[PDB]
């Protein structure tokens, strides 16, 4: 339903300048994800606990095996402090700056990931995998993008990077 | 700084009717407190984790040995579900309906505690223990209250009741 590409060339700044006039800017998002482990390894039991802050909106999410439960939280640092006082340890942290542009029913996310680099994620609101692929093919062609396609999440890419 | 009295007689309803004209009604509060235990007994280590909902405002609080860390939460049931999915077990629950009245710099709380009964808690904003005591003495005299004085919290009284 989405296509994520690591961008080798050109720069995200360069790519943003080319699509700036013809695309509709949505918003910019600053996001940090803090993952935790209970001292029942999440790696042992396929579970996850994540504190996410997106443009000031803080959410805590439990993920079950292959289920999600989410609550909004007033303060990321205090929730992180409470989790640490209860025995949970900070596992991985993912910091992202995302710029969202829109064209037709496609959302184009220019992602700058700390420690990881530059990515582009393209989403189709109600398109066929084939419709999504044709748009990505033309987008990558139109901007002469050298890419590396991945389906891994940014946490998976961070774990792979470590 | 406060004086809590279990009320034997008369009823809280009766007491409220007597002070209703001369006292200033502040507000009514519906409050539930859910205490948790990690599977590091809170009873072993003198710690506490409490989910409190007061008139719709939900807060999660960690209590340290004899320190408090608090975060506001969007939903009590989802936070309780997240805590349970992480291994925490529900220990005790305290449900209170409180009616707050004001006279001079004294706050009078008519408390109805499920499973426990009726209490009155009187607080002085900036008064001496002696000033607080004289007010409680006259209040208890003026309304012919038969009481039992306690410094125990409602969780302590619930634990004692069980």
Residue numbers in the entry:
A (entry chain A), B (entry chain A): 6 to 44, 46 to 72, 81 to 176
From the article:
In this study we showed that the CYTH enzyme in crenarchaeote S. acidocaldarius previously annotated as adenylyl cyclase is actually a phosphohydrolase of the TTM family. SaTTM prefers inorganic triphosphate substrate over NTPs. The general topology of SaTTM is described by an eight-stranded β-barrel comprising the antiparallel strands β1-β9/β5-β4-β3-β2-β6-β7-β8(-β1) with three interspersing α helices and the C-terminal plug helix α4. The enzyme formed a dimer in solution corresponding to 56 kDa compared with standards.
SaTTM was crystallized as an open-state homodimer, bound with two sulfate anions instead of the ATP that was included in cocrystallization. The polypeptide is defined by electron density for R6-A176 but lacks completely residues P44-R49 and Q73-R80 due to missing density. The dimerization of SaTTM was also found in the crystal structure formed by two symmetry mates along the α2 helices and parts of the preceding β5 strand. The dimerization is mainly established by hydrophobic interactions of residues from β3, β4, β5, and α2 and salt bridges between K99 from one protomer and E81 from the other protomer. The C-terminal α4 plug helix blocks the tunnel entry from one side.
